[PDB]
């Protein structure tokens, strides 16, 4: 009895029922759904229980299950009966049927249609019965449904919506099997028969499936127009919902004949927000759809562009005040609208501007660009960039919009995420999940704004130059400008600094635009004097900026970085007048602050000087020849600046001089090179250091741990006390500074690295390379043993067994100094962390020095002691316990292998490769094998340690693949493979290392090692190697299985 079904449904939908009795009722209803005659019960329920919506929906659900899961099982009679039932239920729709009931009825109708409609057309002259089974009346039935009552009209609209969605917009499996007969039928029903005949030549068997001769579009559009005039909001929304699905695919002739776009524009000007959203989606679809005939496309775009006043009015209507609370009913519509507008610019070249259509369009786009939201503006920034970079548009923009777009882009280049209460934040809480996304988007937005300004400067250089001069003059007269000029340090989180920085980024964009102009201009005869004018204007601008005597270090850094761009272009004579100002302004002293106390001000000054050095060196590399003209004046200037410049920067400027001396074709290179370099490398050969390096205790003393012990004694520090609770004092700060200053110059690793790196940074000819090798060999070869000794000491430092000889007072301090983890110090714990930082920094620079020495080629590799010196320093063995370099961080090994060993291997010359690799690789592979075996033996902070171990393993894998490649090769790998495989002494530890890699827990490392083996098996077997391989590889072990099988089959042969 149906009453059981009603009771079960009440149990399920009753809030008070517990989930167990819900399960009971649900099991009963599933059995009912699975019963025979289920569709008939569903039809009976739906027809007899019109008042109870839940029960009727359940009956329709039974019918839907029938048609959607049992259509194949039913014979013809059942299928036709199902169709009759669905049609009868649809025709019986009434005003009391809820919306979801109408949706379900439409779904049933569409399902039956998809599975039966027009299947007979695949045959020639189908019989009348074949027409009946194929549902020849469907169009006629729908036309009947359309006229029954208003509810049936809405139902027909839903049927069309679902039908077209499934047939065209979605990947419906049932349609994929019938596209060739469904889609033409849809096109037939919507389009008039005459229009249809043009594209399709099919015979009379088709036309019998059409009842409305003119097609449905002749019905929907008059209905939509008549609803709009009557302001029937609901009916308009439904009609647009149906229409939005059937504008893409149908023949264009019907769209033009009915003047659909006129109706869509009328909807868009209607105050109904749903109608506006649907109409915008529809217009975008209508613009982007594929057009077979271009006359219709021309008519469409002309219609859109002739109604730019209407679109402007619509946009004005959508706008709202976001200060209090953004309106979420209209904000999505604004985003959609502005998205549509941004896609029209591709149509501009095809528009015949009879009444200023293009002007109005571009002004509208600009108006939408001023939108408070950053997403809305970001929609149009790409349009602006693309329009600026295509020479077709530039006449139009120039006459219309460029002078205003420039002003916008200039005013929109601010830091939104840091301004308090900025109007853009209101929308950020809606459009973005978290402040991270908002900041990333703001960065992208400002990038695109800078591109806009750069291109506007490139295209409209004179206009932008006048505008820029006016802007800067007006700014540095404003009170904020005066504060910036009349102050030495600014809170770089507050209005004055941010405003000044925006001005300097605008200046940078102008300079980048001026640079691009050199490439963009068509190099006519007029080019020379134009470029001369640009250079003069840049010179005047630079002199204007210098005259401000800006001192704020962090803004002065940007000013220096901007001036660096000028000199890419400026003439040789003015080059000095600018470089002298750069050097003498970046390296000014700041009495207001005591440097090296690590305060924000000191850090800002240090960054300023470091950036100045970097820019000078970069420039010297880029144009060494130009600087030759003025080189002595630069020598004089830098000598003038040296006294107040710290060592860490004395080096950075001496390297600049060195670059000029070497790569500028300046005469008498050797003596200048000596004068620049020898005073700096001298510290290596100091006899107290040469002797000192051979003792670890002396190394600790120089590091200052003895002085740390004295300091702890004078403060009565208990070695067991928690250092984190003890604060630093004046003596502590002074000792820290003294130690770091003495250490830095005791081991001039940075000076060596800089000089070698920049010396070899670029070479034109092998003759120049030989000249550099001759210059460096006398100075490096005597020093390499000491660099390796330094690295040796830094390695043995981390071993707890070594500092056991130091005073007990400092044991905890040293132990903390070796901590690995990833601001001014305040506690002895921070002091120990800083000492650890000193040690680690020296280690990194020693590795970089060793890597750089490798670039000298024959000078380093061809030596006999290079491999032993390099290996003995890194791998510190201990008698008894055979662990290598005890106590050194896994991150430490990662850095060692990544910076020193891998580049040294990669950088081996092939004429020297004969001597080096046979002596280097054996011990290298042995060390790697022992290392990774020891670390993996031990296998949140623990997860981070495991990740570091996996990183180290990947680095070793990278080294191995560099050595012998993976399963094509290049000259390096081919050459090395000869050494690896010919030398059994190399091969044995190599195979051990490979096997250990294969069996390690990391998936990527093991898989890549397996590929290496797959690429290596055929060569190694080609005696002792054979047996060792067989035994160990087999007992150790998806191409891994393939390699295992190959090994078995080969060795067992």
């Amino acid at each position: 009895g149906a009453s059981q079904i009603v009771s079960a449904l009440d149990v399920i939908y009753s809030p008070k029922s517990n989930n167990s009795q819900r399960q009971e009722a649900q099991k009963f209803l599933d059995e009912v759904k699975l019963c025979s005659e289920s569709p008939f019960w569903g039809y009976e329920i739906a027809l007899q229980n019109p008042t109870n919506s839940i029960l009727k929906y359940f009956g329709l659900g039974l019918l839907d299950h029938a048609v959607k899961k049992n259509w194949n099982d039913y014979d013809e009679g059942k299928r036709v009966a199902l169709r009759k039932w669905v049609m009868e239920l649809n025709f019986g729709v009434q005003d009391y049927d809820t919306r979801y009931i109408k949706e379900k009825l439409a779904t049933l109708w569409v399902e039956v249609a998809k599975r039966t409609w027009g299947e007979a057309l695949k045959q020639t002259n189908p019989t009348e019965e074949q027409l009946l089974t194929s549902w020849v009346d469907m169009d006629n039935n729908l036309f009947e449904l359309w006229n029954i009552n208003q509810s049936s009209r809405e139902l027909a609209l839903i049927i069309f919506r679902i039908l077209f969605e499934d047939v065209f917009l979605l990947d419906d499996l049932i349609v994929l099997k019938r596209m060739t007969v469904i889609q033409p039928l849809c096109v037939m029903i919507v389009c008039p028969i005459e229009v249809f005949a043009i594209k399709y030549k099919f015979s009379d068997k088709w036309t019998k499936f059409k009842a409305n001769e003119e097609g449905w579009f002749s019905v929907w559009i008059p209905e939509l127009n008549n609803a709009l005039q009557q302001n029937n909001s609901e009916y308009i929304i439904r009609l647009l919902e149906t229409l939005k699905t059937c504008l893409n695919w149908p023949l264009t002739e019907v769209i033009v004949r009915n003047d659909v776009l006129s109706s869509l524009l009328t909807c868009l000007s209607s105050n109904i927000p749903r109608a506006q959203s649907m109409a915008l989606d529809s217009i975008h679809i209508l613009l982007t759809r594929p057009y077979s005939n271009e006359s219709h496309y021309q008519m469409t775009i002309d219609r859109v562009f002739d109604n730019m006043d209407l679109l402007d009015s619509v946009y004005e209507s959508l706008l709202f005040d976001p200060t209090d609370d953004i309106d979420e009913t209209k904000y999505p519509i604004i985003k959609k609208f502005v998205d549509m507008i941004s896609c029209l610019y591709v149509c501009v070249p095809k528009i015949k501007e009879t009444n200023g259509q293009i002007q109005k369009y571009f002004k509208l786009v600009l108006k939408t660009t001023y939108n408070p939201s950053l997403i809305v503006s970001g929609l149009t920034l790409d349009l602006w960039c693309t329009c600026l970079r295509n020479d077709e548009y530039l006449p139009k923009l120039e006459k219309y919009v460029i002078p205003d777009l420039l002003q916008f882009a200039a005013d929109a280049l601010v830091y939104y995420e840091q301004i308090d209460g900025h109007i853009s934040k209101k929308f950020a809480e809606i459009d973005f999940q978290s402040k991270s996304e908002f900041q990333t988007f703001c960065s992208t937005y400002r990038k695109r704004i800078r591109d806009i300004i750069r291109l506007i400067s490139c295209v409209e250089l004179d206009l932008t130059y006048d505008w820029l001069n006016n802007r800067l003059n007006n700014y540095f007269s404003s009170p904020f400008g005066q504060q910036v000029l009349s102050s030495t340090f600014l809170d770089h989180k507050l209005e004055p600094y941010l405003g000044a920085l925006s001005q300097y980024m605008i200046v940078e964009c102008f300079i980048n635009g001026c640079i691009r102009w050199k490439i963009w201009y068509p190099t006519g005869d007029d080019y020379d004097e134009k470029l001369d004018s640009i250079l003069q204007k840049l010179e005047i601008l630079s002199n204007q900026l210098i005259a401000l005597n800006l001192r704020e270090p962090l803004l002065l850094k940007k000013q220096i970085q901007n001036f660096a761009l000028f000199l890419t272009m400026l003439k040789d004579n003015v080059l000095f007048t600018l470089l002298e100002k750069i050097i003498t302004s970046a390296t000014m002293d700041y009495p207001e602050i005591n440097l090296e106390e690590r305060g924000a001000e000191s850090d800002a000054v240090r960054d300023l000087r470091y950036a100045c050095g970097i820019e000078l060196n970069r420039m010297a590399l880029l144009m060494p020849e130009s600087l030759k003209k003025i080189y002595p004046d630069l020598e004089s200037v830098i000598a003038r600046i040296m006294p107040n410049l710290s060592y860490h920067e004395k080096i950075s400027f001496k390297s600049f001089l060195l670059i000029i001396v070497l790569k500028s074709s300046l005469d008498m290179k050797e003596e200048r090179f000596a004068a620049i370099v020898d005073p700096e490398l001298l510290a290596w050969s100091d006899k107290t250091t040469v002797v000192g390096l051979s003792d670890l205790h002396w190394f600790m003393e120089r590091l200052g741990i003895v002085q740390i012990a004295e300091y702890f004694q004078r403060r009565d520090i208990d070695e067991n006390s928690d250092l984190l609770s003890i604060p630093i004092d004046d003596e502590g700060k002074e000792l820290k500074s003294e130690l770091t200053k003495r250490w830095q110059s005791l081991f001039p690793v940075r000076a060596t690295r800089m000089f070698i790196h920049y010396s070899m940074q670029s070479i034109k000819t092998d003759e120049e390379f030989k000249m550099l090798q001759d210059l460096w060999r006398p100075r490096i070869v005597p020093i390499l043993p000491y660099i390796t000794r330094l690295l040796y000491q830094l390695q043995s430092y981390h071993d707890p067994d070594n500092w056991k000889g130091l005073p007990t007072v400092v044991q905890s301090f040293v132990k903390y100094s070796t901590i690995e983890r990833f601001k001014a110090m305040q506690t002895l714990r921070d002091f120990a962390d800083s000492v650890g930082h000193i040690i680690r920094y020296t280690r990194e620079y020693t590795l970089l020095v060793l890597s750089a020495i490798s670039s000298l080629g024959s000078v380093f590799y061809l030596l006999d002691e290079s491999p032993d010196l390099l290996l003995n320093s890194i791998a510190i063995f201990k008698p008894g316990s055979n662990e290598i370099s005890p106590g050194v961080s896994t991150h430490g090994w990662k850095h060692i292998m990544n910076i020193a060993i891998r580049p040294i291997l990669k950088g081996c010359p092939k004429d020297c490769l004969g001597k080096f690799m046979p002596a280097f690789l054996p011990k290298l592979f042995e060390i790697l094998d022992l290392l990774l075996c020891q670390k993996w033996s031990s296998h949140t902070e623990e997860i981070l340690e495991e990740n570091l171990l996996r990183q180290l393993t990947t680095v070793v894998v990278r080294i191995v693949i560099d050595c012998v490649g993976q399963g094509r090769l290049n000259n390096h790998q081919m050459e090395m493979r000869k050494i690896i495989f010919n030398d059994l002494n190399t091969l044995a530890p190599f195979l051990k290392l490979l096997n250990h890699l294969i069996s390690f827990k990391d998936t990527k490392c093991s898989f890549n090692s397996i590929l290496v083996m797959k690429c290596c098996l055929t060569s190694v077997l080609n005696n002792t190697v054979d047996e060792y391989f067989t035994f160990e590889v087999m007992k150790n072990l998806h191409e891994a299985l393939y390699a295992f099988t190959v090994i078995f089959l080969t060795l067992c042969k």
Binding site: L29, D30, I54, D325
Partner: protein, 171 residues
Amino acid sequence: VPTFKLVLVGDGGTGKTTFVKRHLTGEFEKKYIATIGVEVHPLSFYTNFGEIKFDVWDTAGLEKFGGLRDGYYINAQCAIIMFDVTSRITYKNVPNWHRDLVRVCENIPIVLCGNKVDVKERKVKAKTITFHRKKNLQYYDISAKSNYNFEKPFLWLARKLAGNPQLEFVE
């Protein structure tokens, strides 16, 4: 006090029943148990504007077991479309769930939730979640195993239903 029927829907095995459990009790379930039919769980939240109740319908996400697959959405007043970033299939079915959902209830607020964000091996990425940007759905990365965004969906739905963006939860 007001009671809002919420229907929780999403591809099977995406963590729908774990999420409502976590809100019921602070625990967490390791097992994947296929929910059969629907589980009805009355949730409640306390806010600066009193108390609200979500009568959450936790629907089954598997074709085999969905009893009244879409009959549960009847009279719904909000919904959450749940998918897990760990498998792209569950996200690819989001539009299908949205069709099934809006088809029965038109204008209800709907929240799109990416579950299992705690695991670093997310296969769905920000460049693919633009489905919500397209359907005007509110999106949240969440995890039943981590509370960092475990309350955002219900907060947003409470704001939408109560018509009061200033509503906020307290405990």
